[PDB]
Design a protein around this ligand. Structure first.
Ligand SMILES: OC[C@H]1O[C@@H]2O[C@H]3[C@H](O)[C@@H](O)[C@@H](O[C@H]4[C@H](O)[C@@H](O)[C@@H](O[C@H]5[C@H](O)[C@@H](O)[C@@H](O[C@H]6[C@H](O)[C@@H](O)[C@@H](O[C@H]7[C@H](O)[C@@H](O)[C@@H](O[C@H]8[C@H](O)[C@@H](O)[C@@H](O[C@H]1[C@H](O)[C@H]2O)O[C@@H]8CO)O[C@@H]7CO)O[C@@H]6CO)O[C@@H]5CO)O[C@@H]4CO)O[C@@H]3CO
Ligand SMILES: Nc1ncnc2c1ncn2[C@@H]1O[C@H](COP(=O)(O)O)[C@@H](O)[C@H]1O
Ligand SMILES: Nc1ncnc2c1ncn2[C@@H]1O[C@H](COP(=O)(O)O)[C@@H](O)[C@H]1O
Ligand SMILES: Nc1ncnc2c1ncn2[C@@H]1O[C@H](COP(=O)(O)O)[C@@H](O)[C@H]1O
Lengths: 300, 459, 181
């Protein structure tokens, strides 16, 4: 089982994952948080390395999760205040964020193998792994679960792949089928953020009265609040928040338990999303198979 | 007696050359033929072109191409320098053009492909051949193409342009005749375009007895396009000979053109196998020792199961699949009656909010004051910070600072340009350390350095 | 062996020396600006002089000394060890030497006006709109000439914004930075 897919990652560096030409944005710790989040949407990037001018080094990472945390953490009502985060700064928020616990920046050299990267993603439980050249100290690119899987299937030869892929997902037992973190169609966006902070989940598939998935609310989807300057009002439903793209997305990409792993991986990289919600004839929730599951099911 | 180098004795004269003349060598034993470039010490000592010749040999040494004259070795002595080269019988192309009059499409297309593969090889190796002409390209016994003279060539540095204007009067690009800064791919492409023209019409596209009228004829994009040939070639020549360097054809654009594709052997650009070794050779630095000399036998014998061979061949396959779905490594330009564009899932929110604004990057710091006056005003601020500078030319500075937190030092260059008569522009450029971990970013340090300077120039 | 050149004009020219019998004449061969020949000479120093148009004369281009007889002869050291390549030539910036680090003040002598901005740097890579289908983080392959050059975005805020496209071994990256005033 580990004969080929596991060897392949050890035989290639993270260097090969890095695009020929790419964009990267970085924020100084002295920069305000409000301005940093608006800079994200104008550039399209969902992650930026944090640079400290005093320490003269990269202190950490800034993702949409930080916009979620601060939105759920400092909030009173949709009308009354907005006060806490507007006058807040990155280093100031880092102070109250590290008040609870101290976690330093994790990064991997492009010379290190792809196996070392996927390890760092699971070991540290992190989606964004910035690759930084140790010789120059420059941040080249940000590794993502999406980037690795696409690279995996695209560059892997056809002789190694046929081993355990032909088996059905149900029978493989890959993914979390126990507690499915979801939200209703009428549940406020704030309580959705409340689930995002309570769990480590990257998305919350929304459900109707029946418990059927009619949409999905990703941790990426919350940045739209900043994009549209609607983050002030968090009392609105997730359906109202997802109403911005309602005429544009095709549907919710999902799979079935009886389907093969081979069919899942291919559909997952082709859709370019981070996860699929497995369902039945009734389209009720059964479980969720995130890229983390696929990647973690490979390393061991 | 008679002059000789190694086992090669010097014969009849081939030509005058750039620096010094060239003759034919003949092996005392076998009788092999080699072309030698004799550069006399006394002559080359006079001028400071010692670097001009240095760069040439440096580049030509590691050059292997069927249509690039391959430099075998360079022997030298207190008397004179020698460069042995591959000798060819056909002579220069201008002899072949004139003698044969005009060349047809079946032929001209063949030769142009060979020459363009040569200049492509050069451009990819970061070396430009400024003087391009049929008088500079030879032909072997099989009447193939061989690019000869590199004396007027140059090396392409990252983030650097070329000031020197060199080459023939008619073949010189519209930007180099005017004495303007250039990148260097475009100037060879324009020279290639007029070569393609001469390979067809038998006459030069831009020709005049009186100058600058020739240069004025060149500055204007006007040239005689006889009914001799089809419009496909004309559309190529027009796009290749475009007066605007930004609108000019790239090496790639010529590869994607129709007329060029027709009957084109795949041994020119390295995707398919070789007919009459490639960039994929540089996998060795990571895996093992230099290997260029050692594993030739490991890939010459067609043994693909060798530990060195199983590391080589799979690299060319890797680069082929990189082009397949190239949307992974490189971004694509924007998309007749064709609509469907399925956006990337992380691209969904922005296009909608736009249609249910302003982001524009300037070149650098821009100000309109006098050319000697501005640099002096800048030379104040550069000092004020406690950083230091050395000036090369009146408008060009080389500056650096000492890192406050570590004993490291980062530098940069400031070259002032003139965007128009009413305004000037100051350029900011990073640099590199000379050819174990670090807690600092060379890229960020450059920005902080500029930022500090810019803050004083503004406020 | 070794070879010698003669840069002065003459009708009939010969070369002599201490290697050959002190009276020996070696017929030289002709070229447009030079006259040369070749001989096999033993290891060591040497004293030689040219015979032109009937008169014994020396070449000022080469070194000169006084012999025991009191005449004027030249000096050459013949060896078999000179095949040299880089010894013959005897930052790493464009090779035109001039002064050094850490000091300067005011204008140079030269009155040359500043060079015109090349159209290459005016083409910006961040202002270019990518395709909608491809990844947002991707960008087109930049031109090598516009790599190191800085690109600053107009400061319409209290924070400075500036980027540059730096290259890696086979890859390119455009790094943007938001730094407060
Ligand atoms: O013939 C050999 C000789 O040929 C070449 O010399 C030419 C020279 O380059 C031209 O300048 C010209 O020479 C005329 C010269 O300029 C005049 O000055 C004059 O010469 C006079 C001398 O000034 C004067 O010194 C005298 O010489 C005496 C010496 O003081 C004395 O030492 C002795 O010389 C003997 C040496 O001691 C010994 O070493 C050995 O000499 C040999 C040289 O060492 C060797 O270089 C070579 O000389 C060449 C020379 O390289 C060429 O450039 O060979 C020599 C062997 O003979 O032997 C010496 C004698 O045994 O001799 C005298 C004692 O009286 O002589 C005159 C006084 O009037 O006239 C010169 C015109 O003829 O032309 C000559 C070529 O013709
Ligand atoms: N490479 C990293 N180094 C340090 N902290 C990180 C890193 N990646 C993510 N985080 C932290 O985890 C959150 C983002 O998680 P995620 O969106 O899952 O990658 C932020 O609050 C960060 O502080
Ligand atoms: N909505 C969810 N509720 C509970 N667990 C989830 C959910 N989504 C994903 N997971 C699990 O969390 C891991 C992936 O995390 P992430 O990449 O952050 O979505 C996988 O092991 C999944 O089985
Ligand atoms: N399983 C899915 N089905 C439909 N859309 C999805 C799915 N997963 C993610 N997305 C969309 O993709 C974006 C988030 O991508 P990601 O951060 O990679 O999960 C959001 O705009 C979501 O609406």
């Amino acid at each position: 089982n580990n004969s080929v897919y596991t060897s392949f990652m050890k035989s290639h560096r993270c260097y090969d994952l890095i695009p020929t030409s790419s964009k990267l944005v970085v924020f100084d710790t002295s920069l305000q948080v409000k301005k940093a989040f608006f800079a994200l949407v104008t550039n399209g990037v969902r992650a930026a390395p944090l640079w400290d001018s005093k320490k003269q080094s990269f202190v950490g990472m800034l993702t949409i999760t930080d916009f979620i945390n601060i939105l759920h953490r400092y909030y009173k009502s949709a009308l009354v205040q907005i006060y806490e985060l507007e006058e807040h700064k990155i280093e100031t928020w880092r102070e109250v964020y590290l008040q609870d616990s101290f976690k330093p920046l994790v990064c991997i050299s492009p010379n290190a193998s792809l196996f070392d990267a996927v390890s760092s993603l699971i070991r540290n439980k992190i989606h964004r792994l910035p690759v930084i050249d140790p010789e120059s100290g420059n941040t080249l690119y940000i590794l993502t679960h999406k980037r690795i899987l696409k690279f995996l299937k695209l560059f892997i030869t056809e002789f190694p792949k046929p081993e355990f892929m032909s088996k059905s997902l149900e029978e493989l037992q890959i993914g979390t089928y126990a507690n499915i973190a979801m939200v209703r169609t009428t549940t406020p966006v704030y309580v959705a953020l409340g689930i995002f902070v309570q769990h480590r989940v990257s998305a919350l598939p929304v459900v109707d009265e029946k418990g059927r998935v009619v949409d999905i609310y990703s941790k990426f989807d919350v940045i739209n609040l900043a994009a549209e300057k609607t983050y002030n009002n968090l009392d609105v439903s997730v359906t109202k928040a997802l109403q911005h793209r309602s005429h544009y997305f095709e549907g919710v990409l999902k799979c079935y338990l009886h389907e093969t792993l081979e069919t899942i991986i291919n559909r997952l990289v082709e859709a370019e999303v981070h996860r699929l919600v497995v369902v039945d004839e009734n389209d009720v929730v059964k479980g969720i198979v995130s890229l983390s599951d696929i990647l973690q099911a490979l390393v061991l | 007696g008679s002059v000789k180098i190694g086992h090669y004795i010097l014969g009849d004269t081939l030509g005058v050359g750039t620096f010094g003349k060239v003759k034919v060598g003949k092996h005392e034993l076998t009788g092999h033929k080699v072309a030698v470039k004799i550069l006399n010490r006394q002559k080359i000592r006079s001028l400071d072109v010692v670097g001009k010749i240095r760069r040439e040999i440096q580049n030509l040494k590691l050059f292997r191409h069927p249509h690039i004259i391959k430099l075998y070795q360079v022997i030298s002595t207190p008397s004179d320098i020698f460069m042995v080269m591959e000798y060819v019988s056909g002579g220069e192309l201008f002899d072949y053009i004139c003698k044969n009059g005009r060349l047809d499409e079946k032929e001209s297309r063949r030769l142009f492909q060979q020459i363009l593969s040569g200049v492509d090889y050069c451009h990819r190796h970061m070396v430009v051949h400024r003087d391009l002409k049929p008088e500079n390209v030879l032909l072997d016994a099989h009447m193939n193409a061989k690019i000869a003279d590199f004396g007027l060539s140059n090396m392409m540095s990252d983030g650097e342009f070329l000031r020197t204007s060199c080459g023939s009067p008619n073949y010189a690009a519209p930007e180099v005749i005017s004495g303007r800064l250039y990148a260097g791919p475009e100037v060879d492409i324009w020279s290639s375009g007029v070569i393609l023209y001469a390979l067809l019409c038998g006459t030069l596209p831009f020709d005049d007895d009186h100058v600058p009228t020739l240069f004025k004829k060149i500055c204007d994009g006007i040239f005689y396009t006889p009914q001799y040939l089809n419009p496909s070639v004309i559309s190529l020549l027009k796009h290749m000979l475009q007066v605007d360097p930004m609108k000019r054809a790239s090496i790639k654009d010529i590869r994607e053109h129709e007329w060029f594709k027709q009957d084109l052997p795949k041994y020119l650009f390295p995707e398919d196998p070789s007919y009459s070794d490639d960039e994929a050779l540089k996998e060795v630095c990571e895996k093992f020792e230099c290997s260029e000399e050692e594993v030739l036998s490991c890939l010459y014998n067609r043994n693909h199961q060798d530990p060195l061979a199983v590391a080589y061949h799979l690299i060319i396959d890797n680069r082929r699949i990189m082009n397949e779905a190239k949307d992974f490594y490189l971004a694509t330009s924007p998309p007749d009656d064709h609509h469907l564009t399925r956006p990337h899932p992380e691209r969904v929110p922005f296009l909608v909010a736009e249609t249910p604004r302003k982001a524009k990057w300037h070149l650098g710091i821009r100000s309109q004051s006098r050319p000697n006056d501005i640099m002096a005003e800048v030379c104040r601020a550069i000092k004020q910070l406690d950083y230091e500078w050395k000036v090369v030319n009146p408008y060009y500075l080389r500056v650096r600072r000492k890192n406050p937190v570590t004993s490291t030092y980062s530098k940069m260059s400031l070259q002032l340009y003139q965007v128009d008569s009413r305004t000037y522009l100051l350029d900011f450029r990073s640099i590199d350390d000379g050819i174990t971990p670090r807690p600092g970013s060379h890229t960020i340090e450059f920005f902080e350095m500029c930022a500090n300077l810019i803050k004083i120039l503004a406020q | 062996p070794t070879v010698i050149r003669w840069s002065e004009g003459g009708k009939e020219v010969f070369i002599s020396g201490s290697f050959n019998n002190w009276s020996t004449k070696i017929p030289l061969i002709k070229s447009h600006n030079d006259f040369v020949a070749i001989l096999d000479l033993p290891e060591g120093e040497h004293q030689y002089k040219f015979f032109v148009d009937g008169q014994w004369v020396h070449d000022p281009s080469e070194p000169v000394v006084t012999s025991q007889l009191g005449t004027i002869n030249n000096l050459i050291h013949v060896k078999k060890s000179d095949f040299e390549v880089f010894d013959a030539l005897k930052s790493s910036s464009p090779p035109g030497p001039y002064g050094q680090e850490m000091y300067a003040f005011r204008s140079e002598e030269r009155f040359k006006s500043p060079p015109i901005l090349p159209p290459h740097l005016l083409q910006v890579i961040l202002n270019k709109d990518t395709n909608i289908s491809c990844d947002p983080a991707l960008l087109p392959e930049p031109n090598h000439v516009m790599l190191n050059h800085l690109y600053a975005l107009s400061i319409k805020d209290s924070v400075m914004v500036l980027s540059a496209t730096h290259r890696y071994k086979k890859k390119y990256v455009t790094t943007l930075l938001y730094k407060p005033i």
